[PDB]
Amino acid sequence: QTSAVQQKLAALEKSSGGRLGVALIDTADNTQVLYRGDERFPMCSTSKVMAAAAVLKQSETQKQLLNQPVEIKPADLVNYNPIAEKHVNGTMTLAELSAAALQYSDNTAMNKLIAQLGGPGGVTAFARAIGDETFRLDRTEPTLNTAIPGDPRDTTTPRAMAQTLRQLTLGHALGETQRAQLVTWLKGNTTGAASIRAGLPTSWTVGDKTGSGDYGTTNDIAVIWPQGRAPLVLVTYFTQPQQNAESRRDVLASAARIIAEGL
């Protein structure tokens, strides 16, 4: 019941001063490694994968949805808007908003995705439609990042997020073109090199989405293509007891290294 990898993650967690959640799926054999795999964690920016995937699903039944313009007004800007601020009083397409949300983690872009789905509950509804009974999105940006201990809003579990990420990127939750677009976007992420990627050999290819929030919450969810192996799906969630705790991306890298060394 407690594997060697689980014992190592427990030792990492003990030295980290926070709470660590890990779910690995190895698609070479569909085996799973779970650490606090059924405990809820605040998703923060990693929830953007579900919102972008839901808009990709919408695009399966709409000619050129991704080219549809969305107006960006000054009042739409929130706390972190590296792409959207360039387009205030103009428009961005849903493809541009999806890329900005995933690759630059633009929070104004994420709010446009949420609105395109009918609000946070529309993102949750998409999760349910692809078999994820755990994910819940409750708020918009930026308050979905409050990451308060014990608060179920805007949370999921590592087990559920790993299974969902596998279905979206490697399975058939999306159509073929849409799945390929999602993987292309994730592989072009700009924010991930200090997190899961840092713990892996340079030769392994990664597409990922990071997140962070209050309580020193530090997250990453990744699809990994190891050299000479079938892909892996890896979720590393981390959160700490005090609201102003510092980020700990090194803990995510350490967890990824333990997983890689255990394969």
Ligand X SMILES: *C(=O)N1C[C@H](NOS(=O)(=O)O)CC[C@H]1C(N)=O
Q: Does 139 bind ligand X (CB under 6 A)?
A: no
Annotated binding residue 107? no
Q: Closer CB to ligand X, residue 26 or residue 214?
A: 214
Q: Please pick, from the candidates 18, 119, 142, 171, the single residue that binds ligand X as defined by CB under 6 A.
A: 142
Residues 6+ apart with CB under 8 A from 179: 168, 169, 170, 172, 173
Neighbouring-strand partners of residue 222: 208, 234
Q: Does 107 bind ligand X (CB under 6 A)?
A: yes
Task: Please tell me the chain's helix, strand, coil percentages from 3-state DSSP, rounded to the nearest 5.
Answer: 45, 20, 35
The least distance separating ligand X from the CB of residue 127, rounded to whole angstroms, comes to: 18
Element (H, E) at 26: strand 19-26
Whole-number Å distance between alpha carbons of 100 and 179: 17
Coil vs helix vs strand at 3: coil
Given 16, 45, 59, 254, the catalytic residue: 45
Nearest to residue 240, comparing CAs of 15, 60, 33? 15
Q: Does 199 bind ligand X (CB under 6 A)?
A: no
Stretch that binds ligand X, among 53-61, 129-137, 208-216, 231-239 (CB under 6 A): 208-216
8 Å CB contact between 225 and 205: yes
Q: Closer CB to ligand X, residue 80 or residue 204?
A: 80
Q: Does 44 bind ligand X (CB under 6 A)?
A: yes
Render 210-260 in DSSP notation, one character per residue.
EEEETTTEEEEEEEEE-TTS--EEEEEEEE-SSTTPPP-HHHHHHHHHHHH
8 Å CB contact between 209 and 123: no
| Known catalytic membership, residue 15 | no
Q: Does 225 bind ligand X (CB under 6 A)?
A: no
Stretch that binds ligand X, among 61-69, 85-93, 121-129, 210-218 (CB under 6 A): 210-218
Annotated binding residue 141? yes
Q: Closer CB to ligand X, residue 191 or residue 239?
A: 191
Q: Closer CB to ligand X, residue 116 or residue 210?
A: 210
Which residues are designated catalytic?
A: 45
Q: What is the binding site for ligand X (CB under 6 A)?
A: 44-45, 79-80, 105, 107, 142, 145, 191, 210-213
